Design an enzyme around this catalytic site. Structure first.
Site, mmCIF file in Angstrom:
data_model
loop_
_atom_site.group_PDB
_atom_site.id
_atom_site.type_symbol
_atom_site.label_atom_id
_atom_site.label_comp_id
_atom_site.label_asym_id
_atom_site.label_seq_id
_atom_site.Cartn_x
_atom_site.Cartn_y
_atom_site.Cartn_z
ATOM 1 N N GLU A 103 57.832 60.499 65.204
ATOM 2 C CA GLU A 103 58.108 61.324 66.382
ATOM 3 C C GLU A 103 57.280 60.803 67.573
ATOM 4 O OE1 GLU A 103 57.342 65.397 65.269
ATOM 5 O OE2 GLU A 103 58.323 66.090 67.127
ATOM 6 N N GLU A 134 54.835 56.743 75.040
ATOM 7 C CA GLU A 134 53.707 56.953 74.129
ATOM 8 C C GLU A 134 53.429 55.699 73.276
ATOM 9 O OE1 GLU A 134 54.229 60.684 72.093
ATOM 10 O OE2 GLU A 134 54.170 61.823 73.975
HETATM 11 C C1 LIG Z 1 49.246 54.124 65.657
HETATM 12 C C2 LIG Z 1 49.274 55.521 65.110
HETATM 13 N N1 LIG Z 1 49.005 55.657 63.804
HETATM 14 C C3 LIG Z 1 49.131 56.879 63.272
HETATM 15 N N2 LIG Z 1 49.469 58.027 63.875
HETATM 16 C C4 LIG Z 1 49.696 57.863 65.187
HETATM 17 C C5 LIG Z 1 49.631 56.647 65.877
HETATM 18 C C6 LIG Z 1 49.921 56.931 67.254
HETATM 19 C C7 LIG Z 1 50.126 58.267 67.342
HETATM 20 N N3 LIG Z 1 49.994 58.854 66.092
HETATM 21 C C8 LIG Z 1 50.242 60.288 65.888
HETATM 22 C C9 LIG Z 1 51.643 60.673 66.345
HETATM 23 C C10 LIG Z 1 51.539 62.188 66.498
HETATM 24 O O1 LIG Z 1 52.442 62.586 67.553
HETATM 25 C C11 LIG Z 1 53.268 63.685 67.462
HETATM 26 C C12 LIG Z 1 53.235 64.615 66.436
HETATM 27 C C13 LIG Z 1 54.010 65.771 66.502
HETATM 28 C C14 LIG Z 1 53.995 66.874 65.392
HETATM 29 F F1 LIG Z 1 52.874 66.857 64.616
HETATM 30 F F2 LIG Z 1 54.031 68.117 65.954
HETATM 31 C C15 LIG Z 1 54.841 65.904 67.641
HETATM 32 F F3 LIG Z 1 55.566 67.035 67.726
HETATM 33 C C16 LIG Z 1 54.933 64.970 68.658
HETATM 34 C C17 LIG Z 1 54.105 63.839 68.578
HETATM 35 C C18 LIG Z 1 54.086 62.790 69.659
HETATM 36 N N4 LIG Z 1 55.308 62.889 70.561
HETATM 37 C C19 LIG Z 1 55.603 64.285 70.982
HETATM 38 C C20 LIG Z 1 55.928 65.147 69.786
HETATM 39 C C21 LIG Z 1 50.066 62.520 66.775
HETATM 40 O O2 LIG Z 1 49.561 63.324 65.716
HETATM 41 C C22 LIG Z 1 49.374 61.150 66.797
HETATM 42 O O3 LIG Z 1 48.015 61.224 66.377
#
Ligand SMILES: Cc1ncnc2c1ccn2[C@@H]1C[C@H](Oc2cc(C(F)F)c(F)c3c2CNCC3)[C@@H](O)[C@H]1O
Lengths: 301, 621
Positions: free
Chosen positions: B419, B428
């Site tokens: 996501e 992002e």
């Molecule tokens: C390289 C790397 N490796 C491991 N994880 C990573 C990364 C980079 C980012 N991330 C995670 C992605 C996550 O982003 C979301 C979670 C939820 C949900 F949980 F609600 C969402 F709705 C939404 C997002 C983001 N777009 C809007 C909606 C966030 O937890 C970051 O830490």
């Protein structure tokens, strides 16, 4: 409580002075109507024949005959106030709120049964004084209607002028009643000529008065009478009438038919709002002002 | 339910008048602070020395009443642009005098008219009052939809009203406002009080006021038709306009004399009650309208617990994710292999686990076996995942506390689900992330989403332009606020052209020399005369086959809250004539540490390149 600003001075046929006034400052912004059978006892409130308090300021008024008084109200109303049978009271006939802003100019037509109002709402309305209704509503202008002057002898002709720089010659007999009479500065005051029913004069906001013939809108003769705006022009009752022009420069001048200056009065310390020539003495001219003065002038003839 | 006021030009007794107005139902009164006809002289004697008081006393009302109920009105004789030198000089002094008397009283607003083309000296004197002393009052420019010169009765024999269309000519009152507010340097204290007439102008004329700071809408009594019962009502075209202004939350003003047996106010309240109810998106965004927020950087930053809470409460988006996995499980495992094949399912950027819970519901309805992995880099979210791994999921989910680009997986994946999208899709850094996960993806594995595309549309909004201008900060470039995107629930704006695709990414990208940098040139045909201030960005994504998510207004996924549009501003606003094409260039740039956008307008006029080398804004890798 009181109305220091004298807006209108109107002598009827016998010689009784009419007085319109408004309080344009202080706690209350209301107006009043006053009749003085002894003109020299004005503006003294206790030396009057009749008086009345209005709910709003008097921007303009006209004599509807010998008993009636038509009033242009700040409230947006045209009012008719008639003297009682004894002439010691002034009573309301109608208070019609048909205009959406300050009614600033009024003029009764030749028959005395019709009148024309000019408001800041840009409209011009024709009234039936007896029926107490608006006969016709005219949005011919683009800005505030400064002045509306009914024709001396024609009940369907009148001049209007406005901050839209137009002077409209009206004749309600046509399907398009208005007609621009050109020749500059904004038109502020209109005066029909008493003998030439096709000639009239007008004053602009630069203190200039101009002599205009309806027939040809060229060659027009004019002069710089005042330094500030020309608030009013009134012709004398004489067979060959003198023109008295009042102004915001706190002066009054009386001019001949070639616009040369014969009189100049600085007796006023505030704005000069109205002039009325004596029905009895034709060389006696009365001027009310914003300084509460009534000053009776002896014009050198 | 409707904040409404009464416009008056005659107030003989202040408290009497206010009491009648309050009984009628008006929340405020617009009235003159000096007598409308009491002309004053400041230069020549003897009228200069006019004795007595100049206006009524401040004592006649409580300070609270002057602060919340009275709206001042400039005197109609005050004409600072008169061709008469003495009238300009006199109206300059009188205008400052009236404006200062309204400041003395703490009036919440003051009215000034725009009734002619030239209001240069009016603007100079207002600008000078704004720079003098301490006031904070609002200035309301009373300007009509149609100039009185163009709505007059066709009754002047030698000066007829034109019967031909004058496209730009009919929008002249907008230019009166535009010039005025350009002269006053786009003051946040200068707003429009729009005057509606009896006959509404063409739609394009009305649309010229979109994106404009409208604080009040003036309805004169003469615009109201009478019904069978005798009460004032409005045309179905006038009602549509009122519905548009109710969305902007303007203050309705009733002006002019009474011509009906308040009935005008009752009609407004009735219209207000019958407006279509607000939907889920409309109720969620209530408060966020035109509020500028920084776009989230979940890769560079760790998301707060409440940020994840909000992202979880989006049933529509997760129901779409459920079905995308559901259709993939059926496509990958035939019913004969139902219990012979367990699919390696890897969530990348799991958060507190909402996609993990979607993958469980997608395995139940599809009736296939899955081995789940929840990869998350935010160690605080990982605490939430490990408490659920013990308490509820069990051996099923294998929580991995790592960055997807540095994780060495035990076995390759069948499906990777993420996501990682922002309001501009790739903002992002999703391309970079999923690229670094392709090594642990099987030579035939599916990525969910498989594609995403960003979109842009040119917008006009002097209100959002002013909102970005107010973002100037100390210790940085004085214009840096114009070289960075903002997430914003755009509301008071005008979309000048249909959204068009900008950058697309597809996953997996089995091509070498992949390159996530981009350069796109868009050409936007514009049908109206307007002022460009920026570009709205939206996105679309293909989760799997026909299952998609979108924030592109035309294809907007109903009831989805997770994303609001982005706004890419421009330093200097650009005039766009009817028929002109707005041409925009966009770039996606990067080095090994940061990713950023750069952008410029090349038509009808050039702008400077915005954000060269991410000097004002970068997205960290
Ligand atoms: C390289 C790397 N490796 C491991 N994880 C990573 C990364 C980079 C980012 N991330 C995670 C992605 C996550 O982003 C979301 C979670 C939820 C949900 F949980 F609600 C969402 F709705 C939404 C997002 C983001 N777009 C809007 C909606 C966030 O937890 C970051 O830490």
């Amino acid at each position: 409580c009181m109305e220091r600003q004298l807006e209108a001075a109107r002598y009827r046929s016998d010689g009784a002075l009419l007085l319109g006034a408004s309080s344009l400052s202080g706690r209350c912004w209301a107006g009043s109507l006053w009749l003085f059978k002894d003109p020299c006892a004005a503006p003294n409130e206790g030396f009057c024949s009749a008086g009345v308090q209005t709910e709003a300021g008097v921007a303009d008024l006209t004599w509807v005959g010998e008993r009636g008084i038509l009033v242009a109200s700040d409230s947006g109303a045209v009012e008719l106030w008639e003297l009682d049978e004894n002439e010691t009271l002034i009573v309301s006939k109608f208070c019609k709120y048909e205009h959406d802003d300050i009614v600033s100019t009024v003029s009764v037509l030749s028959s005395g049964t019709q009148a024309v109002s000019g408001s800041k709402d840009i409209c011009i309305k024709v009234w039936d004084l007896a029926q107490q209704v608006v006969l016709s509503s005219y949005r011919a202008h683009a800005a505030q209607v400064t002045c509306v002057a009914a024709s001396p002898h024609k009940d369907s002709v009148f001049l209007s002028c406005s901050e839209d720089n137009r002077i409209l010659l009206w004749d309600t007999r046509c399907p398009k009643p208005a007609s621009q009479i050109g020749c500059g500065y904004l038109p502020t005051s209109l005066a029909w000529h008493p003998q030439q029913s096709e000639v009239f004069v007008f004053g602009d906001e630069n203190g200039t008065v101009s002599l205009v013939d309806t027939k040809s809108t060229s060659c027009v003769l004019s002069s710089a009478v005042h330094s500030q705006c020309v608030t009013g022009l009134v012709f004398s009752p004489h067979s060959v009438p003198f023109l008295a022009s009042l102004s915001e420069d706190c002066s009054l001048a009386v001019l001949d038919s070639s616009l040369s200056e014969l009189f100049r009065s600085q007796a006023h310390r505030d704005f000069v709002r109205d002039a009325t020539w004596s029905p009895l003495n034709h060389s006696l001219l009365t001027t009310v002002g914003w300084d509460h003065q009534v000053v009776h002038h002896v014009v050198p003839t | 339910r409707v904040s409404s006021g009464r416009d008056l030009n005659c107030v003989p007794e202040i408290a009497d008048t206010l009491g009648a107005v309050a009984k009628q139902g008006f929340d405020f009164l617009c009235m003159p602070v000096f007598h409308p006809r009491f002309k004053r002289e400041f230069i020549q004697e003897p009228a200069k020395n006019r004795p007595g008081p100049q206006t009524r006393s401040d004592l006649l009302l409580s300070g609270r009443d002057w602060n919340t109920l009275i709206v001042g009105k400039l005197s109609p004789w005050i004409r600072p642009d008169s061709k008469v030198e003495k009238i300009r000089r006199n109206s300059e002094a009188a205008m400052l005098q009236e404006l200062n008397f309204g400041a003395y009283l703490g009036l919440p607003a003051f009215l000034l008219p725009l009734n002619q083309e030239d209001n240069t000296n009016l603007a100079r004197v207002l600008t000078n009052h704004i720079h003098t002393g301490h006031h904070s009052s609002m200035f309301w420019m009373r300007v009509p939809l149609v100039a009185p010169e163009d709505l007059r009765d066709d009754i002047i024999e030698n000066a007829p009203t034109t019967h031909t269309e004058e496209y730009s000519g009919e929008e002249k009152t907008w230019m009166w406002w535009h010039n005025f507010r350009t002269l006053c340097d786009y003051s946040k204290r200068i707003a429009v009080a729009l005057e509606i007439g009896a006959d509404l102008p063409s739609n394009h004329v009305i649309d010229r006021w979109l994106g404009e700071p409208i604080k009040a809408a003036i309805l004169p009594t003469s615009i109201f038709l009478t019904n069978k019962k005798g009460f004032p009502v409005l045309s179905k075209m006038h009602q549509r306009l009122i519905f548009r202004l109710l969305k902007l939350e303007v203050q309705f003003i009733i002006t002019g004399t009474n011509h009906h047996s308040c009935s005008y106010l009752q009609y407004l309240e009735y219209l207000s009650q019958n407006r279509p109810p607000p939907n889920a998106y409309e109720l969620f965004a209530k408060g966020y309208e035109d509020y500028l927020q920084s776009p989230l950087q979940p890769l560079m930053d760790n998301l707060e617990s409440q940020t994840y809470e909000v992202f979880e409460k989006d049933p529509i988006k997760y129901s779409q994710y459920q079905q995308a996995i559901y259709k993939c499980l059926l496509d990958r495992v035939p019913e004969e292999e139902k219990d012979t094949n367990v699919q390696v399912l890897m969530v990348l950027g799991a958060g507190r686990g909402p996609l993990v819970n979607a993958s469980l519901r997608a395995a139940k309805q599809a009736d296939r076996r899955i081995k789940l992995y929840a990869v998350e880099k935010n160690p605080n979210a990982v605490v939430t995942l490990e408490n659920w791994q013990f308490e509820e999921w069990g051996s099923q989910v294998t929580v991995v506390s790592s960055d997807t680009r540095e994780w060495v997986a035990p076995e390759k994946a069948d499906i990777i689900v993420s996501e990682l999208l922002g309001s501009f899709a790739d903002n992002e850094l999703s391309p970079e992330c999923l690229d670094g996960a392709q090594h642990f993806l099987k030579d035939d594995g599916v990525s969910i989403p498989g594609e995403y595309t960003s979109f842009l549309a040119p917008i006009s909004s002097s209100k959002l332009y002013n909102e970005v201008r107010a973002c100037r900060e100390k210790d940085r470039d004085p214009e840096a606020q114009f070289e960075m995107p903002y997430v914003v629930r755009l509301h008071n704006f005008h979309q000048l052209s249909a959204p068009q695709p900008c950058f697309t990414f597809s996953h997996p990208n089995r091509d070498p020399m992949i390159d996530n940098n981009r350069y796109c040139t868009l050409e936007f045909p514009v049908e109206v005369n307007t002022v460009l201030h920026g570009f709205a960005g939206y996105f679309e994504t293909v989760l799997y086959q026909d299952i998609t998510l979108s924030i592109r207004p035309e294809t907007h996924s109903p009831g989805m809250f997770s994303w609001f549009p982005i706004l890419f501003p421009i330093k200097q606003p650009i005039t766009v004539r009817e028929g002109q094409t707005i041409c925009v260039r966009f770039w996606r740039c990067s080095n090994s540490k940061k990713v950023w956008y750069e952008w410029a307008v090349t038509a009808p006029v050039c702008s400077a390149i915005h954000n060269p080398t991410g000097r004002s804004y970068t997205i960290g890798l």
